[PDB]
Amino acid sequence: MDKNWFSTPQEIREGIKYLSAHFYPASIMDRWKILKKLSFEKAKIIANYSLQQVIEEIEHFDFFNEYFKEDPLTTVRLPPSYIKLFDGLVEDFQSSRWRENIATRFHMITEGVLATVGLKILNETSRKYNLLKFNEGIKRIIEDEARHVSFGLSLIEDKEYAVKRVEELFPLAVQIVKEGKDKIEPLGYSIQELVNLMEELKKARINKILGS
């Protein structure tokens, strides 16, 4: 942990933990224990970068677990639209069109829209408060996430279906952010501005799918 974590203002620590819990949902992680087997299973099918990506997902969990040892993320309640998002990903892993369904729910929406915004906030906020170790670990996740999103684009074959999926799931993603208003706004962000960024990100991921 950074030695100056605890000297960071309480409202800022709360917001950071709140967002960190979206990446490492320690209070309800056991709900989706099944995602471990399912992700291993499918990465061993696909191989390619999928095996590296699964390892990187664990590395990301390990980062948040280690960082917050003395200030655990088990205290943080995830909002209900976030629970829905991940219940849906378990379903997608069990679905017929699992490759397309995971690429759209996870790589496009979860990593290419939600995570993009969440990591922007964590980067900006940790830099402002001089949480250097935290900020570096966020920068490394951002670098990983860009490769994950590119890998996602490579998994999509049916362009019309993928776009329609992204368009269908986008509202849930917006609700996740709106549900965090009370924890995010004290970090000095406007929820509307965040939603507008989400819209631009959605457009950009769709453009990339259509140009592939």
UniProtKB/TrEMBL annotation:
The keyword Metal-binding applies. Transmembrane segments: none annotated. It comes from the Archaea. Fe(3+) binds at residues 57, 111, 145, 148. GO terms for molecular function: metal ion binding; oxidoreductase activity. InterPro entries: Ferritin-like_SF, RNR-like. Keywords: Metal-binding. This is Uncharacterized protein.
